[PDB]
Ligand binder design. Sequence first.
Ligand SMILES: [Mn+2]
Length: 308
Amino acid sequence: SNYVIQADQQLLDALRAHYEGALSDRLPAGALFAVKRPDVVITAYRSGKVLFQGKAAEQEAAKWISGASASNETADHQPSALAAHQLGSLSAIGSDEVGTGDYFGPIVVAAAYVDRPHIAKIAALGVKDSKQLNDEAIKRIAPAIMETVPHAVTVLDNPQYNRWQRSGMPQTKMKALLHNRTLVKLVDAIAPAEPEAIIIDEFLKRDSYFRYLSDEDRIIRERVHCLPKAESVHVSVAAASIIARYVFLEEMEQLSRAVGLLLPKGAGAIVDEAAARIIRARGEEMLETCAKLHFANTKKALAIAKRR
Ligand SMILES: [Mn+2]
């Protein structure tokens, strides 16, 4: 009939290695592999969902999980993998940012163009782990990317950040401008070559994004894709992410040195303590050069600084 099961990475590896006849070509979007056993076909997906169809359905299914739920689903495309199925193999530019949630430091937006002939080399660097990678990995992988693939970066320093923020421009509009300006740099730099796609890791509705670029003299919208969790759609986005994290870290060391005090990431208690210290040793005005003032941490800092 038709049975569906959920599988962790190990079960997926087991299901795959078991069948001495796995297929990787011509498969529904999102599928990892498929097998054609005596009156039964197994279909495995990234999500972990496995589809058992055929005569010997419940039989084959039971071989792995007891109480295998049955549904009407079929070996069809997964809506979550429609874009990646199409974009994953093209030559594209991917952009992402970081530091948005950090009290100290700027907002960094980066973009990377990964042509088809470089996708593997970049994937070989293990960039598909941008989310979970400590500062050490970033400092080792990022530099190997910057010198393998063309990229652009835009850094929104604190004084300019505070300037826009107190002028009515919220972070959402800041990111739209930063992304649009980084993409412009990259598009011109890689010319005459043109990217088959331009993927932006979604941070706001496409409607809003371009509605914020109303004043820009140059806007990039030709073949622009706004996708959620873009790092998983194309390797160029994961690359941008890593590069952005790198420039951020380098910017923080430089900034901590200019402030003369180690500036911790995030916006937790240590951040207030750190700001408090700065206020006492360099004056409140120094914060305007290394922090996002409108943040709540500023008031708390001023309190901690005043009490003692
Ligand atoms: Mn993002």
